[PDB]
């Protein structure tokens, strides 16, 4: 099944499902309010602090997604935002895989693919947010690696929303603030990872740009 790669179509009665870590936790509530107030569309926000794809033993995102789509067949969009809790070695079966090795990357993307398969077999449209630049250079190097691994794999398969340049005003590296009409506005929280309310609202707007509500008279006949 081939979803749209530019935007996701929603109708009255659909739900939007938000998944990920604290990156998603701050953004999802703004999208949820916009969906409800603009279109009457309800949502399920399961984002959870400290979670990711590397340690399903802490919280199993692929299994949770499978179970949630089964419980809620009305979900038509799955939005995902995670990463910072994942740049760690992890075990698989009897192997112990080292971060950013070929085998580590293969397993990480197998878990990504399990999510995509769960969604696509049920005609659920996936929106995945790119990882922002981070203030700490070690985490930033890990996240630049992981963001590129993900984007190269996901481009052309799903809807991707990069965030790094948007959150930095195009500067190509981490900034705390971005000028909007010459006045600096802080987008990043004190931890140099997450967002202020202004940063959360901006990313929520970027998500809404990729959601297209369809009235009952769309699509049109020919």
Q: What angle do CA 211, 217, 219 make, to 5 degrees?
A: 60
**Which of the following CATH numbers is that of domain 8-213: 3.40.50.970, 3.20.20.70, 3.40.50.1110, 3.30.750.24?**
3.40.50.1110
Q: How many residues does the chain have?
A: 222
Q: Which residue has the tokens 């010459």?
A: 182
Q: Which pair of tokens denotes residue 108?
A: 């990480």
**Resolution of the experimental model, in Å, one decimal:** 1.3
**Are 213 and 38 in contact, with CB atoms under 8 Å apart?**
yes
Where are the domains positioned within the chain?
8-213
Rounded Cα gap, residues 103 and 109, in angstroms: 10
Rounded Cα gap, residues 155 and 49, in angstroms: 26
Whole-angstrom CA distances from 64 to 20, 48, 72 are: 11, 12, 12
Return left, alpha or beta for 191; rule: phi > 0 is left, psi -120 to 50 is alpha, else beta. alpha
Cβ atoms within 10 A of the Cβ of 35, count? 23
Q: Which pair of tokens denotes residue 53?
A: 């794809």
């Amino acid at each position: 099944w081939k979803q749209g790669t530019e935007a996701a179509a929603v109708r009255s009665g659909d739900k939007v499902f938000f998944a990920g870590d604290s990156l998603m936790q701050g953004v999802a509530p703004f999208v949820q309010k916009s969906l409800k107030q603009q279109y009457g569309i309800e949502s399920a926000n399961l984002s959870k602090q400290s979670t990711g794809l590397s340690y399903p033993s802490f919280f199993d995102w692929p299994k949770t997604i499978e179970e949630t789509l089964k419980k809620h067949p009305e979900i038509s969009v799955l939005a995902v935002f995670l990463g910072p809790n994942d740049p760690w070695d992890f075990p698989v079966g009897k192997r112990y895989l080292k971060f950013a090795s070929d085998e580590w990357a293969q397993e990480y993307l197998k878990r990504v693919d399990r999510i995509l398969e769960a969604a696509h077999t049920h005609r659920v449209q996936v929106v995945w947010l790119g990882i922002p630049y981070m203030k700490k250079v070690k985490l930033d190097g890990q996240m630049r690696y992981l963001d590129k691994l993900l984007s190269e794999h996901l481009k052309g398969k799903i809807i991707l929303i990069p965030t790094a340049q948007t959150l930095s005003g195009g500067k190509g590296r981490y900034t705390d603030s971005v000028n909007v009409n010459g006045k600096p506005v802080r987008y990043r929280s004190k931890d140099g990872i997450h967002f202020t309310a202004e940063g959360q609202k901006l990313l929520a707007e970027k998500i809404m740009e990729k959601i297209v509500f369809e009235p009952s008279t769309q699509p049109s006949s020919t």
